[PDB]
Design a protein around this ligand. Structure first.
Ligand SMILES: [Zn+2]
Length: 260
């Protein structure tokens, strides 16, 4: 009862699920680490072909989604079609929009439309709930755009380049030890450039993430006089049952408390 929905990783599962409510059956492909270097198993693609809707974030992330041509009434929906992804500096694009409350809220809205478009009978519950999500997202944005405006230290160093949009929306500066993907690891040379960055901007916290070994994270910490903490890009299903925004909110707090 209700259409089968399938999502790529955590931010998609959370959004479509909170928007659908109890209506459909939402499932997720990759709930762990590696969405960047992930490739679906034959089983994964099968669940996609037996599902009424399969929502994934982008072609710049789930590259494997582009190569799916069904005989099944399954809809492939690239939820971040509207958004305008920034180019990667240093051409490819930074897919990390979901860590930005606004862009996240407006992508959740886009899913509500696709949900409503396939099931007009309940198009209200979809749009009704998407109003809430988007709403809670503005409230969180206002709350933190305010808290960060009171903070002097504006720079933070994360495991990889995953917080460019979040840093952007709150007037912060972020530097990743690794690139857009956790696989794009730094050479000894770049390790030096990062340590010099931490010293120059006087960063006192290097934010490791669960999805990757903090060995290097800790090394830089020891050498630049900083402590290691955890800042999650929400790419892996968080422990506990919080809302997408409450999880995001949680991290907005550690960042905030740290820069303070
Ligand atoms: Zn990432």
């Amino acid at each position: 009862q209700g259409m089968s929905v399938v999502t790529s990783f955590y931010p998609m599962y959370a959004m479509t699920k909170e928007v659908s409510g109890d209506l459909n059956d939402v499932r997720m492909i990759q709930s762990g680490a590696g969405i960047h270097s992930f490739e679906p198993s034959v089983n994964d693609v099968a669940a996609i072909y037996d599902a009424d809707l399969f929502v994934y974030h982008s072609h710049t992330l789930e590259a494997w989604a582009r190569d799916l041509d069904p005989k099944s009434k399954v809809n492939v929906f690239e939820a971040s079609k509207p958004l305008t992804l920034d180019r990667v500096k240093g051409t490819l694009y930074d897919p990390h929009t979901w860590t930005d409350p606004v862009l996240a809220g407006e992508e959740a809205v886009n899913i509500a439309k696709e949900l409503g478009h396939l099931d007009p009978k309940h198009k209200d519950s979809y749009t009704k709930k998407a109003k809430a999500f988007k709403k809670e997202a503005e409230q969180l944005t206002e709350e933190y755009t305010q808290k960060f405006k009171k903070v002097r230290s504006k720079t933070f160093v994360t495991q990889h380049t995953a917080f460019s949009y979040l840093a952007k929306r709150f007037g912060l500066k972020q530097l990743g030890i690794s690139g857009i993907s956790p696989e794009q690891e730094p050479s000894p040379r770049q390790l030096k450039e990062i340590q010099d960055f931490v010293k120059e901007y006087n960063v006192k916290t290097i934010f490791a993430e669960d999805n990757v070994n903090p060995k290097i994270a800790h090394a830089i910490a020891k050498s630049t006089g900083a402590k290691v903490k955890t800042l999650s890009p929400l790419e892996a299903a968080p422990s506990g049952n919080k809302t997408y925004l409450e999880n995001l909110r949680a991290n907005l707090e550690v960042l905030y408390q740290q820069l303070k």
